[PDB]
Design a protein around this ligand. Structure first.
Ligand SMILES: CC(C)C[C@H](NC(=O)c1cc2ccccc2s1)C(=O)N1CCN(C(=O)[C@H](CO)NS(=O)(=O)c2ccc(Cl)cc2Cl)CC1
Lengths: 587, 101, 127
C-alpha cells in the first residue's frame, strides 16, 4: 500500500481483513494492480505468485480479493499472466506457480478466470540440470502439470471448457509434453512408474482429439521423438515400455508397437512394430542411435529389449554373417598379398618398373591389388575406429606414389603400412569367438605403461649419469667424450636381459642403481597387478555391444534399400513394416 | 589358441621386418651374402625367449618396427596369462565328478 | 485334414482342444471325430526341426502336453471312440515321450508335466 512489502506481507499471511478497503486508494490514485509499485525491481514478482507461493494447506483465500480487485482496476488481462524478468526465472506466470504447488483448487479458478495457458518459462533455472537449470519440464504449464505427476490438473487443463493447451504445442527445444516427460524420466522404479503411466495417458488423450497423427510424430529441434530421445538419453525404464506399447481400445489401438499375431496353444508370436528401429538409412534409427553413440548410459541392457536383440540376430543369420566371413577372408587375403608383394618386391635396387617376367607380372598384380584396395579404403574412410583405417589408406597411397616416380629408399611407408594393415586386421578377428579382449587390453596398457616407464627410464639416465661423472669426466659406457645414450641402452638390457658391466668393469652409484631396479620391478608387478584386475572377464556385455557394431557396420556398407530388409506386414487396420518375434509361455 | 595367435605374429614380422631390412642390404647380421629369411626367424625366436639379438648394429624405422613386435609380443603373453587365469574356474568341482564317472 | 506343409492333418479336434475349451471338444467327439488324428506337419515338429510346437502328434498327446487334464480324462474315458495312450506317432513317442518333449527345467512346467505324466501311467496301468 504505502510500501510494497506490507501488501506482500499481508497477502502472504492470508489476512483478507486488512486487505479489505485497500481498493479505496487504488481507485483514488487510479493505480493499476499491475503498476510498478506492485512489482519487484529485479524479479517483478506480482502479488499473485507471492500469494500462491505461501499456499497454506490450500487455504490461501486472499487470491479472489486480488482477482476481484484486478477486475475493478480494469486491467485483468496482464495481471493474470504476469511474467518475471529475471534470468534465474522468466515468463513464470501465476499458472506455473499454482500448478507447481500441487493445488488444483486455485489452478482451475485461475484458468477459469482466464490465464495464459501457453506460458513459456524460458528461464535459466528451468533448463536441464546439464545446462545450469535445476528443473526442465517442457517449459509449458501442460508439460509442467505433466512432468510433476499431476494427473488431475493435466486432465482439467486440457479438458477445461475455457482456454486449453494443445499437447502438440512445442517449446524452445520443440520437446512438447512427450519429449519433456521423457526429459524428467529416471531409471528409478517409482519415477518410471508415473512417467510411463501418464505418458500413455497423454497419447490416448491426444489420439482421440487428433486421430490424424500420434503425438510422437512431432520432432524436437534435435529431431528425435520420445522413443529416440529415451534412446539417446539412456532412459531404460521408459524406453523398454515404449517398444511394448499395446493399446486395447480399437479407436486408439493403431498407436501400438507390440501386436499379437497368433498363438498355437502355449506358444505366442508377438508381432513387434519397428517402424523407427530400422529406417533402411532413410532416417535416423533407434538402433543406430543406441550403438553408435557414447553418451548412452545403459547400452548393455537397452540392447536386451525384445525386438532389438532379436533384430540384430536376424541380421546376423542373413546378410550379416556371410558378409562378415566374406570380409575376413577377402581382407586377410589382401594383406597376405601385401605381405608377399612386399617380401618379393623387386630387389637389385632402383625398382622403377622392373616387371619383365611372368613371375614379375604376378608381383605386379599383387602391387596393383594392394594399390587398389589402398585407395578403395580411402573413399569409404572419407565417406563417413577408422583412424588406423584412414592411416592405412593414405600410407599405401603414399607408397605407390613414390614407387610410381621410381624414387628409391621409400619402401619405408609401404612396410609400415603392412604392420598397420595387420593392426587394422584386429577389427574383424575380434567379432568371432568372443575375441578382442586382446585389443581392449592393448589400448588400456598402451597409454599407461609407456610414460610411467619412460619417465623412470629417463629419470635415471640423468640422475645416474650425473652421479657417474663423479668418477669420470665424461669408459664402461663411453670411453672419451660425453654421451649418456650408451647409458640408456645399458638400462635397456639391465632388466630385459641383465648383463650390465657398470664401472666395476662410488657406493652411492651402487645404491642408486639398486633403486632403479626395485622401482622398475615393482612397477612391472603393479602393471601386472593393474592388468589382472582390469580384465573383468569382458563382463559378457562388451562383446554383445561390440558384436552389434559389426552387424550395423556392414548394413550401412552396402545399399540397404535392396532386398536386405527385415520382414514386412499387413496393409491397413493394423502399412507398417512390423517384425515378428516368438516366445513360449506355459502360464 | 596360443599357436596361431603367435605364429601369425611370428611370420607377420618375418616378412614385414625382413622387407624393411633389405633397404639397408641387398640380401650380414642375419645372412651375409645370399637372400634368406629363416635366420631372421631364429633371431626372433631368441629375442624374447632369451634375448641376445645382434640386429644390424652388429634405419630408424627398422628400430621402431622391431619395437612393435616386442610390445605386441609381450602383451599377447600377458593376455595369454590373463586368459589362462580366468579360464581355470577352479574346476567348478563338477568336471572331476563327470570325468571321474 | 489340411493339405499345407506348414500344417497337416490338423483335424477339427486338434483346434477344439487347443483353444482350451472342452465344451465343444466333447460335443465334437460325441458326434464322432477321428480321435487318432495325426498332425504330421512342419509347424508341429520340434523347435529344432523348424516346427514351433511338438506335442506327440495326437489329440490325446495334444490334450496331454497342453496341460489339459479334464479333456485327457474325457478323451480317454468318453463312452464314444477313445484313443489308446499307447498309440504311437511318426517318431513313436506316444503321450509319455511327447509329454517329455515339452518338459522344461522351469519349475511350473515340470509341475504339471510330472503331475499329468503320473496321471497317464496310473490310467494306462489300470486299463
Ligand atoms: C560386402 C562389402 C561391400 C561391405 C563393406 N566392404 C568391406 O568390408 C570390404 C571392402 C574391401 C575391399 C578390399 C579388400 C578388403 C575389403 S573388406 C563393409 O563391410 N563395410 C564398409 C565400410 N567398412 C570398411 O571399409 C572396412 C572393411 O574392411 N572396415 S574394417 O575395419 O577394415 C573391417 C573389415 C572386416 C570386417 Cl568383418 C569388419 C570391419 Cl569394421 C566396414 C564395413
Amino acid at each position: 500500500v504505502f510500501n510494497r512489502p506490507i501488501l506482500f506481507d499481508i497477502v502472504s499471511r492470508g489476512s483478507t481483513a486488512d486487505l479489505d478497503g485497500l481498493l479505496s486508494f487504488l481507485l483514488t490514485h487510479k493505480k493499476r494492480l499491475t503498476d510498478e509499485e506492485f512489482r519487484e525491481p529485479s524479479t517483478g514478482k506480482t502479488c499473485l505468485p507471492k500469494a500462491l507461493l505461501n499456499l497454506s494447506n490450500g487455504r490461501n483465500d486472499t487470491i479472489p480479493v486480488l482477482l476481484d480487485i484486478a477486475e475493478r482496476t480494469g486491467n485483468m488481462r496482464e495481471f493474470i499472466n504476469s511474467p518475471f524478468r529475471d534470468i534465474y526465472y522468466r515468463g513464470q506466470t501465476s499458472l506455473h506457480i499454482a500448478i507447481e504447488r500441487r493445488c488444483k483448487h486455485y489452478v482451475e479458478l485461475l484458468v477459469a478466470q482466464g490465464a495464459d495457458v501457453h506460458a513459456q518459462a524460458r528461464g535459466r533455472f528451468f533448463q536441464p540440470k546439464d545446462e545450469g537449470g535445476y528443473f526442465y519440464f517442457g517449459e509449458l504449464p501442460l508439460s509442467l502439470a505433466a512432468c510433476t505427476n499431476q494427473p488431475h490438473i493435466v486432465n482439467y487443463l486440457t479438458e477445461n471448457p475455457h482456454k486449453k493447451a494443445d499437447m502438440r504445442r512445442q517449446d524452445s527445444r520443440g520437446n512438447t509434453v512427450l519429449h519433456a516427460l521423457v526429459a524428467i524420466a529416471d531409471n528409478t522404479r517409482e519415477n518410471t512408474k508415473f512417467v510411463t503411466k501418464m505418458y500413455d495417458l497423454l497419447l490416448l488423450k491426444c489420439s482421440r482429439l487428433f486421430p490424424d497423427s500420434n503425438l510422437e510424430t512431432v520432432l524436437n529441434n534435435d529431431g528425435l521423438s520420445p522413443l529416440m530421445m529415451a534412446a539417446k538419453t539412456g532412459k531404460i525404464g521408459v524406453f523398454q515400455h515404449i517398444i511394448r506399447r499395446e493399446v486395447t481400445d480399437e479407436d486408439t489401438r493403431h498407436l501400438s508397437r507390440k501386436f499379437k499375431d497368433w498363438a498355437y496353444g502355449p506358444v505366442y508370436s508377438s508381432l513387434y512394430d519397428l517402424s523407427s528401429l530400422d529406417t533402411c538409412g532413410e532416417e535416423v534409427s533407434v538402433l543406430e542411435i543406441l550403438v553408435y553413440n557414447s553418451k548412452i548410459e545403459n547400452r548393455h541392457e537397452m540392447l536386451a529389449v525384445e525386438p532389438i536383440n532379436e533384430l540384430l540376430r536376424d541380421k546376423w543369420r542373413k546378410f550379416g554373417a556371410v558378409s562378415f566371413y566374406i570380409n575376413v577372408v577377402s581382407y586377410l587375403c589382401a594383406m597376405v598379398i601385401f605381405t608377399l608383394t612386399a617380401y618379393y618386391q623387386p630387389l637389385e635396387g632402383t625398382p622403377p618398373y622392373p616387371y619383365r617376367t611372368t613371375v614379375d607380372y604376378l608381383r605386379l598384380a599383387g602391387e596393383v591389388i594392394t594399390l587398389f584396395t589402398g585407395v578403395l579404403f580411402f573413399f569409404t574412410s572419407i565417406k563417413d575406429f577408422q583412424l588406423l583405417y584412414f592411416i592405412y589408406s593414405v600410407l599405401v597411397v603414399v607408397s605407390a606414389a613414390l614407387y610410381l616416380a621410381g624414387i628409391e629408399a621409400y619402401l619405408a611407408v609401404m612396410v609400415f603400412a603392412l604392420v598397420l594393415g595387420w593392426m587394422n586386421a584386429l577389427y574383424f578377428t575380434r567379432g568371432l569367438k568372443l575375441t578382442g579382449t586382446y585389443s581392449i587390453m592393448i589400448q588400456k596398457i598402451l597409454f599407461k605403461d609407456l610414460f610411467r616407464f619412460l619417465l623412470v627410464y629417463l629419470l635415471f639416465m640423468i640422475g645416474y649419469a650425473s652421479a657417474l661423472v663423479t668418477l669420470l669426466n665424461p669408459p664402461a659406457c663411453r670411453d672419451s667424450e660425453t654421451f649418456s645414450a650408451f647409458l640408456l641402452d645399458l638400462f635397456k638390457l639391465t632388466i630385459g636381459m641383465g648383463d650390465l658391466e657398470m664401472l666395476s668393469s662410488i657406493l652411492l652409484l651402487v645404491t642408486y642403481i639398486i633403486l632403479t631396479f626395485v622401482l622398475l620391478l615393482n612397477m612391472l608387478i603393479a602393471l601386472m597387478g593393474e592388468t589382472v584386475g582390469q580384465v573383468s572377464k569382458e563382463s559378457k556385455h562388451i562383446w554383445k555391444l561390440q558384436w552389434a557394431t559389426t552387424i550395423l557396420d556392414i548394413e550401412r556398407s552396402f545399399p540397404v534399400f535392396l532386398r536386405k530388409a527385415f520382414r514386412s506386414g499387413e496393409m491397413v487396420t493394423v502399412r507398417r513394416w512390423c517384425f515378428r518375434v516368438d516366445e513360449v509361455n506355459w502360464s
